[PDB]
């Protein structure tokens with residue numbers, strides 16, 4: 001069969017952050 | 023006078 | 039990226055606003071009856087509640103709403119205007135004790151911010167710091183219920 | 190600090206299909222949980238102690254596409270309904286729950302953390318019921334204790350009239366038993 005593919009991720013280690021302006 | 027948004031905070035820290 | 043907490047300011051001060059249930063809530067003692075700015079002109083508050091020290095405008099752009107708490111936890115976390123997280127033990131309906139008291143300056147400018155539960159869901163809105171001799175040891179807050187009610 | 194999560198899609202349908210066949214994935218990895226797919230379904234995989242675990246009912250006995258080509262499962266336990274591959278270089282691992290917490294938090298593929306009240310070593314009730322559709326695609330996802338440690342992996346939903354009120358999970362202990370066997 002075909003391989004299992006990572007199509008995205010979920011990050012739990014992120015901390016509240018001020019969104020940088022761009 | 024209005025309240026103005028001067029910045030934002032993303033709680034999960036999503037950089038995206 | 040969309041933020042749940044808006045760092046806002048009037049001519050007088052600077053504080054925070056938190057989007058919960060599609061409404062951008064903040065403290066009446068910061069906003070008053072002020073209208074919120076938008077690229078299409080000022081937008082009037084959808085809710086004004088002087089008694090609860092609560093006001094609300096429709097959620098702005100570049101924002102995302104927070105989910106109200108449903109696990110009834112007492113281990114709260116306050117997020118400051120500098121993105122600092124402060125553990126707070128819920129001492130009551132609308133009161134909580136910092137697990138580590140901080141100088142009042144540390145909490146200054148965070149009214150309107152959220153008090154998150156262990157799941158990052160909204161428990162309440164930081165109303166005012168309760169301090170002794172310039173050191174904040176506790177905080178006052180607007181339980182999400184009030185918001186859910188005001189809506 | 191509170192448990193907060195965010196999701197990022199790393200590849201589309203067509204890129205996924207080519208990668209599935211070639212078995213060679215050159216994309217950079219980040220995160221504790223990986224959104225995973227096969228030609229038939231999409232679910233989650235959680236890295237715990239250097240191993241990328243997921244549900245056997247999802248991964249079957251498939252290899253995982255990595256930069257070096259396909260990677261054979263390290264652990265496979267049809268009974269435990271678990272499969273594990275070496276955690277991808279780049280991922281961050283969760284650690285098993287030490288304190289036996291009663292209040293758990295399920296992280297969905299949408300990066301929402303929903304609280305569940307533990308009602309057994311393998312079950313917990315959603316404090317706030319959600320449609321069964323909301324939970325689709327989250328099998329293999331972690332159930333975290335307040336400290337953010339892995340208590341289990343989402344396996345099945347106790348659905349009724351299309352609404353899920355409880356969830357069945359593979360407690361983090363079955364992992365050790367699976368590695369031991």
Ligand SMILES: *[C@@](=O)([C]([C][C][C])[N]C(=O)[C]([C][C]([C])[C])[N]C(=O)[C]([N]C(=O)O[C][C]([C])[C])[C]1[C][C][C][C][C]1)C(=O)[N][C]C(=O)[N][C](C([N])=O)C1=[C][C]=[C][C]=[C]1
Pocket residue numbers: 229230231232244246247321322324325326327328329344345346347348357
């Ligand atoms: C998971 O594997 C899912 C989570 C959906 C709830 N789990 C299951 O499908 C399991 C598999 C069996 C082998 C345990 N079944 C169930 O959870 C079923 N309940 C059940 O067996 O209950 C028993 C209890 C008493 C222990 C439910 C019953 C109601 C209907 C749904 C099954 C998972 O997420 N799989 C990936 C997936 O569903 N992908 C979908 C897809 N087509 O790729 C999908 C992804 C994203 C959005 C929609 C659909």
Ligand SMILES: [Zn+2]
Pocket residue numbers: 106107108109110111155156157159304
């Ligand atoms: Zn909660």
Ligand SMILES: [Zn+2]
Pocket residue numbers: 285286287288289290334335336337338
């Ligand atoms: Zn724990």
